[PDB]
Ligand binder design. Sequence first.
Ligand SMILES: O=P(O)(O)O[C@@H]1[C@@H](OP(=O)(O)O)[C@H](OP(=O)(O)O)[C@@H](O)[C@@H](OP(=O)(O)O)[C@H]1OP(=O)(O)O
Ligand SMILES: Nc1ncnc2c1ncn2[C@@H]1O[C@H](COP(=O)(O)OP(=O)(O)O)[C@@H](O)[C@H]1O
Ligand SMILES: [Mg+2]
Length: 216
Amino acid sequence: SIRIFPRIAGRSYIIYGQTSGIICKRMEKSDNEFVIYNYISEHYDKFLKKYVPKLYGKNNDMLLLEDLTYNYNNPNVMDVKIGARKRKSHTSGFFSIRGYTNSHDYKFDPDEYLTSESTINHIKNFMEAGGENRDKTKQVLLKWIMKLSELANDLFEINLKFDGVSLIFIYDDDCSKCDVNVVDFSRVKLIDTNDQMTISAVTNLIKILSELADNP
Ligand SMILES: O=P(O)(O)O[C@@H]1[C@@H](OP(=O)(O)O)[C@H](OP(=O)(O)O)[C@@H](O)[C@@H](OP(=O)(O)O)[C@H]1OP(=O)(O)O
Ligand SMILES: Nc1ncnc2c1ncn2[C@@H]1O[C@H](COP(=O)(O)OP(=O)(O)O)[C@@H](O)[C@H]1O
Ligand SMILES: [Mg+2]
């Protein structure tokens, strides 16, 4: 019957679709996530196509979403919250890592406030599954930098407050494939300017990933 999806973070009920390449995410409190997918579809379709998993449909309170992990033999996933948290400040100042594949092995704790040193170490821990080939992990980082730098650019022209949105970083163990996408629109709001807090989150990650890519 029901196969639970292996979430990295969050609190939402998420299951595999009965069909390949789909995940079903329950909207717990309101349909606001659906309203925001549809708004972005009508007002910023290009943003939706570049950065956001496909919404294929709705079944009562379930969103049918593209499984970002589907085309991977051995996916490693990191969830980084880049939008404002509800009440708390960010564990790494401009963003909060919420989890990653194998994080329990490094005693990662999502409640722990981190220094720059510990933040960088947790991202390094996440890259460990990618093996010893410096050149291949560096190509993963550069492709993430490529898409995040375009996202930061595009966000200047989008009049949404991306409260609670996450970045889902994915790379294959063999480092042949990687991506990053924006998920979780449940608390996103209309506003009459751009979201400088969320832009600062992305530019700060671009800065951290760039030092990792340039490390000797
Ligand atoms: O601090 P946040 O905003 O990163 O964390 C929220 C938390 O989000 P998440 O960890 O499920 O993504 C849950 O909120 P929802 O995203 O589910 O609405 C927690 O329930 C929420 O606590 P609360 O809903 O009981 O206020 C966390 O917020 P808070 O710790 O800032 O209060
Ligand atoms: N489209 C997706 N494809 C693959 N994994 C996803 C997708 N959306 C969410 N996830 C997984 O589910 C987790 C929680 O997703 P999110 O939308 O942030 O839900 P919540 O509202 O519970 O925080 C993420 O950390 C990630 O592991
Ligand atoms: Mg979330």
